[PDB]
Amino acid sequence: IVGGYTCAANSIPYQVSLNSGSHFCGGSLINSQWVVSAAHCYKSRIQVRLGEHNIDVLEGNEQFINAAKIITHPNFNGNTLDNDIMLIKLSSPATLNSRVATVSLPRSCAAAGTECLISGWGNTKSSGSSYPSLLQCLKAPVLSDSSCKSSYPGQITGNMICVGFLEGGKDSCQGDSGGPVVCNGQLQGIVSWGYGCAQKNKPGVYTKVCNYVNWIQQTIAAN
Numbered sequence: 001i002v003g004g005y006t007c008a009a010n011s012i013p014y015q016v017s018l019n020s021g022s023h024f025c026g027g028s029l030i031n032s033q034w035v036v037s038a039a040h041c042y043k044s045r046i047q048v049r050l051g052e053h054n055i056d057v058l059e060g061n062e063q064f065i066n067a068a069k070i071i072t073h074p075n076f077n078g079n080t081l082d083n084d085i086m087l088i089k090l091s092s093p094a095t096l097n098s099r100v101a102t103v104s105l106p107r108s109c110a111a112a113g114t115e116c117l118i119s120g121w122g123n124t125k126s127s128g129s130s131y132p133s134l135l136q137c138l139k140a141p142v143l144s145d146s147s148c149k150s151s152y153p154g155q156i157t158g159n160m161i162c163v164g165f166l167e168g169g170k171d172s173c174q175g176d177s178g179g180p181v182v183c184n185g186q187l188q189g190i191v192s193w194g195y196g197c198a199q200k201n202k203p204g205v206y207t208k209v210c211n212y213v214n215w216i217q218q219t220i221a222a223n
């Protein structure tokens, strides 16, 4: 996250870190057994780390739970990142408490200008790189489909939304992928891609979670 602030410890209790030797992507806890993330974060083996603030220190709220099943969207396009969503079933159910909680799936698609919270352990620098130990947070609005498409001519599918600031300076970046965009307590976005990060007229692009409630419920019922 560039241009954000350090979250209060455990104030984003649905945020997970996906770990394969180190942190490599975020995800969102949506059920005690299920995490949603980006299909471009796919690996064969993933340890889900819940209840984190400092990913470099055992602070005493962590739950480390290996993935039992990792299911990418059947229409995920690894080139364009269309349908950039996957579901991780945990090998044991996460215990839900104040520090580890589910986030709601969306009732409807978010209106343009809805304020959201974006979080992750991704790059905090627009010039160079720095990877935080502590979970970072960014308040940002949903952008109009028109503004999104004018920033990325011909690249925005019906499964993508833009969230952020056209002026630059405030965005998700490398290592935030798969993590949450939450607006009024509902998961509306998954960190997916952008042309670099925090550039002028290149807002973050996010998987449009309000297209996937059927697929998510289908996948949970089947597995």
Ligand SMILES: *[B]1(O[C][C][C][C][N+])O[C][C]O1
Pocket (backbone or CB within 6 Å): 024, 025, 122, 171, 172, 173, 174, 175, 176, 177, 178, 191, 192, 193, 194, 196, 197, 203, 204, 205
């Ligand atoms: B992701 O990339 C996220 C870039 C977001 C730009 N707005 O994170 C690790 C793998 O790709």
Ligand SMILES: [Ca+2]
Pocket (backbone or CB within 6 Å): 052, 053, 054, 055, 056, 057, 058, 059, 062
């Ligand atoms: Ca920790």
